[PDB]
Design a protein around this nucleic acid. Sequence first.
DNA 1: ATGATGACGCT
DNA 2: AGCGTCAT
Length: 431
Amino acid sequence: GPHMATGQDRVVALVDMDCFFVQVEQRQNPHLRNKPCAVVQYKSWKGGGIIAVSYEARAFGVTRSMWADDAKKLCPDLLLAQVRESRGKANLTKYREASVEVMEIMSRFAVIERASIDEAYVDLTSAVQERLQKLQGQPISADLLPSTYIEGLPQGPTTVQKEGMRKQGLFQWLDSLQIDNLTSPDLQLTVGAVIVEEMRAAIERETGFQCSAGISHNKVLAKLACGLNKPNRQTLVSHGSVPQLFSQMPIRKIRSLGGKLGASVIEILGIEYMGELTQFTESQLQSHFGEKNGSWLYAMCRGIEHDPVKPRQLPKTIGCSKNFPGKTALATREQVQWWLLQLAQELEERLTKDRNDNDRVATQLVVSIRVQGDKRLSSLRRCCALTRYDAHKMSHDAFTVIKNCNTSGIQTEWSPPLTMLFLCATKFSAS
DNA sequence: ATGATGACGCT
DNA sequence: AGCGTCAT
Ligand SMILES: Nc1ccn([C@H]2C[C@H](O)[C@@H](COP(=O)(O)NP(=O)(O)OP(=O)(O)O)O2)c(=O)n1
Ligand SMILES: [Mg+2]
Ligand SMILES: [Mg+2]
């Protein structure tokens, strides 16, 4: 009772951009706005691979990883924007620059953890404390929360349209809120949501991009919350909402459980939903999934997680990769060297920009290859020192550390053919 | 023949 | 170090 911690100590948000690469392209080209639209890479293979899809196009069943030629079968009027190509490969600079626009705005409000090119976690615990004091003790108006859903509401005795349902739940929540108690976790979450409304308003005003967000007590619930009412809405998931929410929540939807661990939780325990984990002891879970995973699952199915919002706005690595599928797998030494040089040249440009922008230098170069006949992301990784931002030196060094994989007795030929090259700059130091 | 990335755990 | 998982 009095000593059972409830994981309600923090206010955490996750802000995720809506159909992000599409919005970047729609801002640039007004002809694409409010249309079924997708972003594709490499136009020559079946129209290009789709990597982002507007919500209008999603309505036709267009999805990521679809070939554009196939997407056009579902959506004849689908509009497309192509990823830039430079040095023979996709170049994602435009989307990285747009990401920086958004991350810099979020950073005005609180220290963020950059979690992907289009999302960040926010620890709003301190900002909420400050706002509660500035608030005399006055009630929180629904007008301060114009795009907020309260997960689980409305409920109970006694509209058929979306916005009507959103307001009814919000009214139930606010009507029941105690504002007298500055330490109520529900009150803290509500103030957190007010601040996220302000943050999302700033992002849209200053960039033109819309986003969604989740507000909860930890990263996993905030991430889950964010997706519940996409696009262009934010969702508050209270501690109290967790038992019903998890009662029918497939295990694979919780971050980190979407892969083999999640599958084994399902198979080994014979369950389907996150809430069903509560039936097991902490020791039982640890026996099946290990000390760390066991403890994490035991707490997480109760809505509790302690993973901190890390103070990190910048990527820890900078890398360049290219696949060479099927018949195009690299089979000559000079092929391998030309492409390593292409990669190294992009990497040099990004590293030099990074060193000017962020006062740091990378010190290790990691070279990864995939071999024809494998299936793994990487077949092989080798590292060496990164001592100069020079593409010719980097590409020469990368060849040095991988050139012995070449089983071919003939020196001009490469065997077995390479289906992927990857260069990654790592181990940054202040500069 | 998704592809281009990026974080972090394990031994 | 180098490999494996999970992720957008
Ligand atoms: N497998 C993936 C997933 C995302 N991305 C890129 C394109 C996406 O626009 C961007 C952000 O990914 P995302 O947040 O998962 N989805 P996106 O923002 O496009 O749509 P939402 O569902 O978030 O509204 O990363 C990618 O290149 N490969
Ligand atoms: Mg997104
Ligand atoms: Mg995202």
